[PDB]
């Protein structure tokens, strides 16, 4: 019972927190998550919350997405969003700067799946290769996702057929990520 993908995520999360400790002598501090409840919240300032990863509670799968949409979602994506509760984390893959998305709480988990569903419906409408996003970029319509056909991590432009290979699988991608402060 060793999910190496969940472990790759925990390892990166651990490196992220270490970077925050080394550079700011603290846990991650997020102004963006201020106002949204979560088990991860340690303490709050006038406009931000300090947070730490926490155990994930609830069903550990995104079957709500498979229920709402005719699709068999890669196991690694089920794992990616249900391994822990955590805030978003900034990272770098090679020269690519990104924000790794996560599940903040049970309520946010419902939102996460709603967004994944809207996303798949859009791709079906345009007959585009189905993907499940895991990170955002600065380019407005550019995201990093797990290409559902093979499980590879790809960089895509929403609304287009364009995909570019980044990693063989989610675990590989996560093990290559460097924290970004």
What does the H/E/C string look like for 76-108? HHHHHCCCCECCCEEEEECCEEEEECCCCCHHH
C-alpha 39/C-alpha 63 separation (Å) is 23
C-alpha 51/C-alpha 26 separation (Å) is 10
Q: Which residues pair with 44 in a beta bridge?
A: 49
C-alpha 29/C-alpha 27 separation (Å) is 6
Resolution (A): 2.0
CATH 3.40.1580.20 fits 1-181, yes or no: yes
Q: Where do the H-state alpha helices sit in the chain?
A: 4-24, 63-68, 75-80, 106-125, 170-176
Judge contact between 93 and 87, C-beta under 8 A: no
Experimental method: X-ray
Q: Is 157 helix (H, G, I), strand (E, B) or coil?
A: strand
Judge contact between 156 and 143, C-beta under 8 A: yes
């Amino acid at each position: 019972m060793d999910d190496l993908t969940a472990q790759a995520l925990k390892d990166f999360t651990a490196r992220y927190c270490d970077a925050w400790h080394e550079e700011h002598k603290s846990w991650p501090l997020s102004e963006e998550l201020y106002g949204v409840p979560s088990p991860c919240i340690i303490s709050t300032t006038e406009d931000a919350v300090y947070w730490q990863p926490q155990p994930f509670t609830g069903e550990q799968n995104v079957n709500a997405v498979e229920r709402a949409f005719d699709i068999v979602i890669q196991p690694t994506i089920h794992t990616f969003y249900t391994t822990q509760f955590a805030g978003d984390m900034h990272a770098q893959f090679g020269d690519i700067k990104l924000t790794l998305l996560q599940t903040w709480s049970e309520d946010d988990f419902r939102r996460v799946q709603e967004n994944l569903i809207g996303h798949l419906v859009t791709q079906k409408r345009l007959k585009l290769p189905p993907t499940l996003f895991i990170a955002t970029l600065e380019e407005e319509l550019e995201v990093i996702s797990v290409c559902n056909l093979s499980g590879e991590v790809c960089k895509e432009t929403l609304g287009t057929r364009k995909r570019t290979h980044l990693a063989s699988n989610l675990a590989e991608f996560l093990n290559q990520l460097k924290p970004l402060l």
